[PDB]
Design a protein around this ligand. Structure first.
Ligand SMILES: CCCCCCCCCCCCCCCC(=O)O
Ligand SMILES: [Cl-]
Length: 133
């Protein structure tokens, strides 16, 4: 399963191309403003086989709980209602969200102790890097 090194409290330290990723998702300017300003905290936890990813920011929280490989309903921070699946590939924790025949991927991997999230929509790529408290 998921490496235990994913578990903990993560703080965003850099973000590349999030505005165009949000545009790709159809997010409007006021909400993009909040997304570009936020320095969220991402807490990854696990109890038995249930993985939880909680995101906290000054103006918005989200939380998902899932089992690997089992599709679940998700309401994203930009209010998309998606069918999502999280899988594990070469130790990368890979989330796919599907809605209205669209899809986006959020792939989270550990690189030299940091968590690197690659977000892709319509081939637009954003990279968000986190360090662990
Ligand atoms: C984090 C909340 C900010 C406020 C609103 C943001 C709305 C855009 C959400 C786009 C999807 C977020 C992808 C985040 C990937 C990650 O965990 O780094
Ligand atoms: Cl914030």
């Amino acid at each position: 399963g998921m490496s235990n090194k994913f578990l903990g409290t993560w703080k965003l330290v850099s973000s590349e191309n999030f505005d165009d990723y949000m545009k790709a998702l159809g997010v409007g300017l006021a909400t993009r403003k909040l997304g570009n300003l936020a320095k969220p905290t991402v807490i990854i936890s696990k109890k038995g086989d249930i993985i939880t990813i909680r995101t906290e920011s000054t103006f918005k929280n989200t939380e998902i709980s899932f089992q690997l490989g089992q599709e679940f309903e998700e309401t994203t921070a930009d209010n998309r209602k998606t069918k999502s699946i999280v899988t594990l590939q070469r130790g990368s924790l890979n989330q796919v969200q599907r809605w209205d025949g669209k899809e986006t991927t959020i792939k989270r991997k550990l690189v030299n102790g940091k968590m690197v999230a690659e977000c892709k929509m319509k081939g637009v790529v954003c990279t968000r890097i986190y360090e662990k408290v």
